[PDB]
Ligand binder design. Sequence first.
Ligand SMILES: CC1(C)CCN(Cc2ccc3[nH]c(C[C@]4(O)CCCN(c5cc(NCc6ccccc6)ncn5)C4)nc3c2)CC1
Lengths: 236, 197
Amino acid sequence: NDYCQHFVDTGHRPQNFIRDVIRLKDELIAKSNTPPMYLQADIEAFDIRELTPKFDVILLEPPLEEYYRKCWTWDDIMKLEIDEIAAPRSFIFLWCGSGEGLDLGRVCLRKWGYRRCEDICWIKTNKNNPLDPKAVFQRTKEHCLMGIKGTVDIDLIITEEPEIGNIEKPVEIFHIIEHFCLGRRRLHLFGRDSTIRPGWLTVGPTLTNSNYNAETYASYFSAPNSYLTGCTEEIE
Amino acid sequence: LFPPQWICCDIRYLDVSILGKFAVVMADPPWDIGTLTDDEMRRLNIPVLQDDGFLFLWVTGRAMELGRECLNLWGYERVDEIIWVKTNQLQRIIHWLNHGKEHCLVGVKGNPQGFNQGLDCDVIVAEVRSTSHKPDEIYGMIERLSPGTRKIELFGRPHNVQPNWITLGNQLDGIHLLDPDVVARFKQRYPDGIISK
Ligand SMILES: CC1(C)CCN(Cc2ccc3[nH]c(C[C@]4(O)CCCN(c5cc(NCc6ccccc6)ncn5)C4)nc3c2)CC1
């Protein structure tokens, strides 16, 4: 059964035929989650250094020109000073799309001081709906690269192609990150009102409200909570 | 021409200038992650194999970065990336994360014309066979992309031999060459029929 032949014949992408798409751990994550914090900021014009403390996890979702068929070019993304707000041992999750970002985003990771350790693929089914010039094939996926600096889940997210103009990335990315148990100071750059989430600081230009206070934020991680994984009990 | 041809050899030492120009190159190298060092990989004479065409390059682990490097050194621009989702016979998926997929980089060189860009998608779904054994779907995809053209695979194994394809690899069974111009340049370059150093 050749699913590529089938796709050429019918318009059904091969991923359409993949079948089939721990609790207490989610409870432990949900218990130790800081209250959602969020700040409206124009990130190009904003000294990212006043975001403190250094973060254990950074989720970086710049608005790529290709998502639309204010955009950020990889030129702009590469000039972000991500290394200035990353904890010495920290992790980054960078959405790179499916074009040149697959290479330029790897440049960014190295520029900011990370080495890649996972390539998480968002495979987009078109069960409800049977071109870049440089493209050779139809692009049906996006990549989210995972970076580490310093010293359960699989690397695939399968969902239906969102409606045109919908740029949301699948919420499953957050479950994957949180199940790694990498620390509690978590930053989502270029999030939206729709992505605000307990356990996360969201910064982005389209947010409509802010509640961020650097001292209140640092509050949540003072002793005896400085080094928690976010997957453990609350320290009584 | 048309039927499968192959050459058992060490790809490090073979003079691939005898083989001519190809519309498609596919390589599945033994990255050091009988392997080749990064320098050995950087030094392979890929650039002579093509003037205008595509390169399909299987990558994994840090070869994801290194393969991009060889890809650019050899003179290609990476313009696509195929992923093969690994399933069992029931279409379910088989360091930090478990891996459900293998990656194959797509590089373009020159300006190829007359190829049918856009017929397949960049995701393959297919069953796993032997360890290190690639899905036949890639040959179907590559055929629709550039039908009837000469293609060469590097580091293939005996099951990989295909019509329109010359397969190179050190576990193939001897030499099997049918293209006349290739037989000719082979005999000229290797009269006593041996290939070392
Ligand atoms: C689609 C994938 C899943 C397929 C598997 N992929 C990884 C993978 C796994 C197993 C492989 N098995 C071969 C065929 C080869 O024959 C095996 C043995 C050395 N091969 C050479 C090596 C060579 N020079 C150096 C040398 C010579 C002699 C002794 C030591 C070193 N010259 C010609 N062939 C190459 N490729 C493989 C690729 C991931 C994607």
